[PDB]
Amino acid sequence: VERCGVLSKWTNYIHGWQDRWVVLKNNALSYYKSEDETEYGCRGSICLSKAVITPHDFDECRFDISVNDSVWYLRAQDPDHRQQWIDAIEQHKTESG
Amino acid sequence: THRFVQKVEEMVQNHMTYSLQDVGDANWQLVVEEGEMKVYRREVEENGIVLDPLKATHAVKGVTGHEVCNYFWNVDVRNDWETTIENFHVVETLADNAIIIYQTHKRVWPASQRDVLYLSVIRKIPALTENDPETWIVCNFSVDHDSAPLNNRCVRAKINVAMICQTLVSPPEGNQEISRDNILCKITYVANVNPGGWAPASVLRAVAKREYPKFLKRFTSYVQEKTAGKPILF
After folding, report:
1. Distance between CA atoms of B58 and B189, rounded to whole angstroms?
2. Cβ separation of B169 and A13 shorter than 8 Å?
3. Which residue range is the domain that position A81 belongs to?
4. Which CATH number describes the domain made up of B1-234?
């Protein structure tokens, strides 16, 4: 149960939200600049074993993925698209555990 | 370009490589845990002498790693939060971010008084990518200097101290500018002190279990108060 697609990711205090290519596979999330640069090293990844996926109450597009102090901030394009990503990550995590 | 540059590079590199590692786990002993502050202690013996490496972690809201390291390094504000130093002065200015300090510590009766001679350097570790956070570091390690030779009034201690700070930023509400409610400073503090004398361990360890928590709580709280209402310095 893998998935990939564009998502808006909070990067750093200069750039903030930027569109990035996210991939759910191998009990982890990995993100790249775009789909074209998948075969060019990952820019960042996070294991889902002990991860918590929290949707934002006021930002209906935003959902956060935290493994201890390490946190990813992601925005889909609407609440419908967010829920699909949230459910995929939970199903993938459970089927991997 | 001063004569300690290579030495500084090695010390910073070693701290960036081996001090940021989360808890030799069980080799480190948690002695104090208060909120986000955790103080770990290890009891090592090498070269005919027993030492006690200190390592602590802390998360401080509303301040950046740059701000924390600035206040930790700036001698001009030391008297506002430090409570164990009796006197000190700058022996030599090596560069805008590197100085040699001589200081005497108030005597922890009945142990002999300690002084220390160390190079203090503050440096930024640039982030290699957008995912890696910007790290600031202050390293204080002992050096020799003819202006501060050994005396018979104090016991010369040897130190290797580092405070490594990283700033975690969370997305602000909507499209607003970052505020201090969105920033968190991850502090790693390590201290390897060689007292240089023959004081009993029970007194040395109890004093360390007492003064390190007090200094971290007071120092971080001080940085919070001085930065309140001020524009963020990333």
Report:
1. 8
2. yes
3. 1-97
4. 3.30.530.20
Beta strands in chain B (DSSP E): 29-34, 37-41, 44-45, 50-51, 54-61, 85-95, 98-105, 114-125, 135-142, 155-169, 183-194
d(CA A13, CA B167): 10
Task: Indicate the helix (H) or strand (E) that contains A80.
Answer: helix A79-96
Q: How many domains does chain A have?
A: 1
Q: Which residues of A touch B170 (CB under 8 A)?
A: 10, 71, 73
Q: Do A12 and B169 touch (CB under 8 A)?
A: yes
CB contact at 8 A, A41 and A56 = no
**Domain parsing of chain B, residue ranges:** 1-234
Q: How many CB atoms are closer than 10 A to CB B142?
A: 16
The CATH number covering residue A55 comes to: 2.30.29.30
The experimental method behind these coordinates is X-ray
CA A45 to chain centre: 9
